[PDB]
Amino acid sequence: RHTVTMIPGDGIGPELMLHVKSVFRHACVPVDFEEVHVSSNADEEDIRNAIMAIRRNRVALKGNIETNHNLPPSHKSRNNILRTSLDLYANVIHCKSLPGVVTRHKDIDILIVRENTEGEYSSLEHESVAGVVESLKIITKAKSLRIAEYAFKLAQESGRKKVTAVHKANIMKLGDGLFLQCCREVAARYPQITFENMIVDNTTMQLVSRPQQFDVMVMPNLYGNIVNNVCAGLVGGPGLVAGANYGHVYAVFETATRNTGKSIANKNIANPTATLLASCMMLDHLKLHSYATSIRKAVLASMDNENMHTPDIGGQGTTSEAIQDVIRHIRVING
């Protein structure tokens, strides 16, 4: 039996965490969740306990914390505090077109590896003189090498054939140029893999017109934020795609797009897919592959049936009907 940290978060997090437990109970998953809560308090006591809880368990499942962006810069995104404190440097999402969820684009299969601890999320900011603010984007060789090493290893291990570095180095010559140089240093050790690069501007155009061209994509923090959401939106929105946050020792799992769902919370219409697919991602990490596969095949099987779909993907069903259907498809495996 494994003990895993659970941070319910705000919005749809808690209600979906209940459904993850239902599914686990039903599937006889040998995983116990130690829940830890993160309030809106300006005091960082709650978030420090969450860090420590993760240091202990090394694995967490996580909802999104809402950030009130009207408060002072002292009050930092608890989400961002967690991944930097835990040094979960690699955000990984796999946006693959789902057969049952028809969108404008098909045959999408993108692995996005995003630097997760650095760049413009460094929270370095000052006002030199009244009405003049400087934000310090930080790019280092250590972290760019590290993320490129991951992206190339992932491609090699997944049987992928191309890595694409997304950047803005024609304008950010030193910053994004350094990141891009580290991708090339690593590329020299993976001659089996094709290395290309694309400016973040042009990438978004390519994603909305011909996203079949992309395979593995590797990039700094903010461009990752953009490409993740674009690619998520292409395959049918925020309810479908699971996100992973890997450090050397720790690992936290979440919905790829990282949304609260504040405005749909407590109305039994949130899409449980992304959250469930994340729990399976966590099970694979814990080496519980048989349970991961049972739940994942159940979840994906439900997506083929349009009657089970929730509003966010063109349907009319509730969360609980989708979970009912997921559980039915584990019954046929389970008994």
Binding site: L136, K137, K141, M172, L174, D201, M205, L222
Partner: protein
């Protein structure tokens, strides 16, 4: 009858300018073309180009080959507001059909401050600069644009959750202006969410106002929804009533003389130019003349079928004459 400085530029630049000039004349447009050759000297643009612009106040720029000429022009004329109206074109069809978005980008500042440091070896610092003045200015223009172009909504795009001080200040200015202009409906939105919803349902958006890096990306994003840079108008607004309107695509050196080019985008930039001046009648007539030509869809360029740039241009002239 007014004069407008003309920068045909390079490659296919002359052809598409010649096509835009001929359509403007075919449509009886009260415009004179003071042709001009922008180029780096000593670094400056030539005194004749500088003088043309301070005189005429209005310009048209074809694709310029490769500091950057665009960078140069920006600092010279204080071009602070990049505007890109993206609308779906019937006939040149994409998976996105309901599109009508204006991307309003702060153009001087933000992530493109040009300030980078090697703090220590293997550690680089890039400065994103957000000021009170520039943020207030690009806000005021966005609200002014919506009024003068009859738009209902203006959305401020940001990442203030992460970059509190900088994006929060930018956002602070957009709020103040919105309070002084309650006849336009104002909402805030995170860049990642905007991107997320844009690719699912782009009809939800109207006018997007934002800092430099977000605008640079979203403008290209939107442009990709409507079919690319080859069909996209663009306009830059400067200090004391100056404005350039460009073809934002490449010079296409392959087909420079072969007459396979496509003037649509520069034309639309010219239509946009006319609208800014106040010649709405001529603008709407040429715009409609273009859309109808594209809609027929047999006499299209390689960019398309196999009909030449001249046959396309003549088709515009044929129809625009018959209002």
């Amino acid at each position: 009858v007014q004069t407008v400085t003309l920068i045909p530029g390079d490659g296919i630049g002359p052809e598409i300018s010649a096509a835009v000039m001929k359509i403007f004349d075919a449509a009886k447009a009260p415009i004179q073309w003071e042709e001009r050759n922008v180029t780096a000297i000593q670094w400056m643009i030539p005194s004749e180009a500088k003088e043309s612009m301070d005189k005429n106040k209005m310009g048209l720029k074809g694709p310029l080959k490769t500091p950057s000429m665009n960078l140069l022009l920006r600092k010279t004329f204080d071009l602070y507001a990049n505007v890109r109206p993206c609308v779906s074109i019937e006939g040149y069809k994409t998976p996105y059909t309901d599109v009508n978005i204006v991307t309003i980008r702060e153009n001087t500042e933000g992530e493109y401050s040009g300030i980078e440091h090697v703090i220590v070896d293997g550690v680089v610092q890039s400065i994103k600069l957000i000021t009170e003045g520039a943020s207030k200015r690009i806000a005021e223009f966005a609200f002014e644009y919506a009024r003068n172009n009859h738009r209902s909504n203006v959305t401020a795009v940001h990442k203030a959750n992460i970059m509190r001080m900088s994006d929060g200040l930018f956002l602070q200015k957009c709020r103040e202006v919105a309070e002084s202009c309650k006849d336009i409906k104002f909402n805030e939105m995170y860049l990642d969410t905007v991107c997320l919803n844009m690719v699912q349902d782009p009809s939800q958006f109207d006018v997007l106002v934002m800092p430099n890096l977000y605008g640079d990306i979203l403008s290209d994003l939107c442009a990709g929804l409507i079919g690319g840079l080859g069909v996209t108008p663009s306009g830059n607004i400067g200090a004391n009533g100056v404005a350039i309107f460009e073809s934002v695509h490449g010079t296409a050196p392959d087909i420079a003389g072969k007459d396979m080019a496509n003037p649509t985008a520069l034309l639309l930039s010219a239509v946009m130019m006319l609208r800014h001046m106040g010649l709405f009648d001529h603008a709407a007539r040429i715009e409609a003349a273009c859309f109808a030509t594209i809609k027929d869809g047999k006499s299209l360029t390689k960019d398309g079928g196999n009909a030449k740039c001249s046959d396309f241009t003549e088709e515009i002239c044929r129809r625009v004459k018959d209002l």
